[PDB]
Design an enzyme around this catalytic site. Sequence first.
Site, PDB file in Angstrom:
ATOM      1  CB  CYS A   1      43.744  45.974  38.444  1.00  0.00           C
ATOM      2  SG  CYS A   1      42.485  44.715  38.126  1.00  0.00           S
TER       3      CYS A   1
ATOM      4  CG  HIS B   1      39.199  44.764  40.855  1.00  0.00           C
ATOM      5  ND1 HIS B   1      38.260  43.889  41.346  1.00  0.00           N
ATOM      6  CD2 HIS B   1      38.694  45.247  39.711  1.00  0.00           C
ATOM      7  CE1 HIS B   1      37.224  43.872  40.539  1.00  0.00           C
ATOM      8  NE2 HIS B   1      37.459  44.686  39.539  1.00  0.00           N
TER       9      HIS B   1
END
EC number: 3.1.2.-
Lengths: 187, 190
Positions: B105, B125
């Site tokens: 992420c 991400h």
Amino acid sequence: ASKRALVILAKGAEEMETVIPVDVMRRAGIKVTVAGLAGKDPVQCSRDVVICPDASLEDAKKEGPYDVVVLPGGNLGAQNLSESAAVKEILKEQENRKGLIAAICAGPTALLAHEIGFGSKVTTHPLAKDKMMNGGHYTYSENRVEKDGLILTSRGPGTSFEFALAIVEALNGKEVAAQVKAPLVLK
Amino acid sequence: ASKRALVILAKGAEEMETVIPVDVMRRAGIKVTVAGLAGKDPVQCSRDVVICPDASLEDAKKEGPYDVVVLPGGNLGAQNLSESAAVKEILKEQENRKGLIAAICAGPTALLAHEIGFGSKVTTHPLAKDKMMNGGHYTYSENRVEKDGLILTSRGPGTSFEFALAIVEALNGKEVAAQVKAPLVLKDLE
């Protein structure tokens, strides 16, 4: 006002089935209360993750009503939910007042234990099906998430995003669920 | 003997990106230490879930070595990871001993911060892409999980299961990864 969710956290709860719905609901603007079945003490989950509840169930009960009551799964977690008179009282009240009840994986077996939602279409983990269907008090479904009126059920850790988003949709609508889902990088 | 994983838990960590890999790795029979960056106290995550770590990082760092070091995401969590000299030392030592480093992420921006695995194909991400690739120290991948040598990266809460199963496959093999996957009720292949 904000919608409200009560998530009942018992020793042995599956931690993914607990955390995914709490986090996803909070992303939606829902006021979630993680309530310790046994009080305010940290709870040891199925794979030994230790989660500190926001409040005891006792205290959270006197803070409702809740737009949804959520039962995570976990073999031991579900057994513990199933044996609790306090859980029984809460679910009977939610059902009587036409509030949503959502249970995942082995979680729905606590619905059976507490005689909740008889006649409903439900799903569970495949390994929980036989226990759930004992007595023929439900119609069984293979859907990854199943919603029959105010009884919402799902199958496993791997359906937890879907389960949580179905709760968000039920409470806050499709557009809110969409806004929440986008940044999650789901398939 | 069992493989070992160190998962570094910082205030503001994304709790799904922390709990999914810990749980999935433990299912595989990996011994996982959830180590609190700030010490032994419970840690408030990005959506207010409070997780009690197994040990402080200061302590866990002494119980090496680990087969994988795992960096969860979460904006604030990754920032705290990025700002820690202790994390830098751990990551430097892991890269030097040819051990796996796994970050999800915003977590990979901690690799950038600490100068780890430059030249690797990585993913993050989508909202962390710009920060990760400022300076051109990596190649970007849009794959939901990427593994380039010992740098394993992934994109978000929704890729946490695939990320964790990739760590399991890297440490314990494809058979164990398939064993662990089967009861999760993730999606089928079609």
